[PDB]
């Protein structure tokens, strides 16, 4: 459960833990700070330390001699239940048996570290709720950390004094942490798990329960800016702070993985959750997942392959959709990415029981409109307008230095699903409809409590990220895309505060 992720070892450190702390099968990954964007699978075997290599540019993660997956988690987790897949140049086979622990409690949600005893309190006591708690490094007692927790009725402020903020002293005793006596933990994070299991209990009675840690990453819309200049001069720790979460979303993806859908699968390995995958009644299997904000919802799904297109348009029929939204070039740095879906200007097509024309091809500059009308063979009455944007400005590696030509494009296709009362879903897609897409949807759903409720709002990045990821794995890909989220929004509420 991620704990074999090293976000700040380095690929001569990890060789260390490897060779003292490790055995033959024992593994880590970590960011290489090789490409930013990279990442590296360090696996202890016959006596040496191989690296492996995983490659994201933003569409998925790419193990090198490997296969390429949505997230680091499902990467591991698809390789300690199929032995002799992870292979070397030379067909030998490379077992991951033994997840070599991280300590660094940096990406826990409720680790903060740079925090002082009265800002923690004004925290759990502003945003606070009955079991909310962080761990901050003492000030007092250099090396020690401190847990504070809340427990009471309500949450927010307060006078009934019904609430409290007990703190407790964690000290750091040669390489361990305890509370004060008792157990002493090899990490902070074994510390907090054995106290959520089993609660200290005050003296009084007072159960100190630890149920979710601290929101610090919800902020008011109209100060983002402050909160942007805090986290560039943040960023990384707060997105590895996300990563670490992607554990808790191993959810099941049966129907993608059987026999007769294997090949509707762009990449086999990125699949759509069960429990929100598009399912056909027009078989019923497309890789694509709804994804809905809990108004307007989305369906994201891989870029067409030339025998998925039948049901991409069979989706967007029985999904009453009236906009799609594709953010890739049909080739991209040699490869394929997404194949021609749509007829040429004027031509009308038929791809099986549906009929597709493009009835107008306008030029913008960021993006391609086509004007297309959709209906369903032997029954003319069917037709509806599909409006498609490609968006064609895309680089082939990272995100767009300003998020200008983006968030243009964005409040266009917003306007368009205005327009029309019917719409169902926008559909989304790039390659594997995973990276690019879950951006676009991100910065989506973001501008769009903005535009409703307005400046003076609250809005969550990671939060908003987190609750996407669990209705399709791996949605938005990097820290460049997540990053770019955070300007995006930016971008958006300074011309809102100029317009």
């Not at 959750?273 to 809990?294: G, K, Q, W």
Request: net charge neutral; charged share 30%; glycine share 8%.
């Amino acid at each position: 459960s991620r704990r074999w992720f090293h976000p700040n070892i380095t690929g001569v450190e990890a060789e260390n833990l490897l060779l003292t702390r490790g055995v033959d099968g024992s593994f880590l990954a970590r960011p290489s700070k090789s490409n930013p964007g990279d990442f590296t699978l360090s696996v202890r075997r016959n006596g040496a330390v191989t690296h492996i290599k995983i490659q994201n540019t933003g569409d998925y993660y790419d193990l090198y001699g490997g296969e390429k997956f949505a997230t680091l988690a499902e990467l591991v987790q698809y390789y300690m239940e199929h032995h002799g897949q992870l292979k070397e140049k030379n067909g030998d086979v490379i077992e991951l048996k033994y997840p070599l622990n991280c300590a660094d409690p940096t990406s826990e949600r409720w680790f903060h570290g740079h925090l002082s005893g009265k800002e923690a309190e004004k925290l759990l006591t502003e945003k606070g709720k009955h079991g909310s708690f962080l761990v901050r490094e003492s000030q007092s007692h250099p090396g020690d950390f401190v847990l504070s927790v809340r427990t009471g009725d309500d949450k927010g402020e307060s006078n009934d004094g019904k609430s409290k903020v007990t703190h407790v002293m964690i000290r750091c005793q040669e390489l361990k942490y305890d509370v004060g006596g008792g157990e002493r933990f090899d990490s902070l994070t074994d510390l907090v798990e054995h106290y959520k299991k089993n609660p200290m209990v005050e003296t009084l009675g007072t159960v100190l329960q630890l149920k979710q840690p601290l929101n610090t990453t919800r902020i008011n819309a109209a100060e983002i800016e402050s909160r942007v200049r805090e986290l560039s001069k943040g960023f990384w720790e707060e997105f590895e702070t996300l990563q670490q979460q992607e554990c808790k979303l191993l959810y099941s993806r049966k129907e993608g993985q059987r026999q007769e859908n294997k090949n509707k699968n762009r990449y086999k390995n990125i699949l759509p959750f069960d429990h929100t995958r598009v399912v056909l009644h027009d078989s019923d299997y497309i890789n694509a997942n709804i994804i809905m904000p809990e108004k307007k919802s989305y369906i994201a799904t891989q870029g067409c392959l030339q025998n998925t297109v039948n049901d991409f348009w069979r989706m967007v029929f029985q999904e009453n959709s009236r906009v799609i939204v594709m953010t890739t070039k049909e080739v991209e740095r040699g490869k394929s990415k997404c194949v021609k879906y749509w007829p040429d200007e004027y031509a009308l097509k038929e791809y099986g029981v549906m009929r597709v024309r493009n009835v107008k091809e306008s030029a913008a500059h960021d993006y391609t409109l086509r004007e297309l009308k959709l209906s369903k063979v032997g029954q003319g009455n069917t037709e509806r307008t599909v409006w498609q944007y490609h968006f064609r400005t895309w680089p082939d590696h990272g995100v767009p230095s300003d998020p200008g030509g983006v968030l243009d494009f964005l409040e266009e296709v917003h306007h368009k699903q205005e327009s029309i009362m019917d719409a169902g879903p926008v559909v989304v897609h790039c390659s594997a409809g995973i990276g690019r897409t879950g951006t676009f949807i991100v910065i989506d759903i973001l501008i769009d409590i903005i535009r409703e409720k307005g400046v003076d709002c609250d809005i969550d990045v990671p939060k908003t990220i987190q609750m996407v990821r669990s209705q399709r794995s791996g949605m938005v890909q990097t820290e460049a895309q997540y990053r770019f989220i955070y300007m995006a929004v930016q971008h958006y509420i300074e011309t809102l505060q100029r317009r």
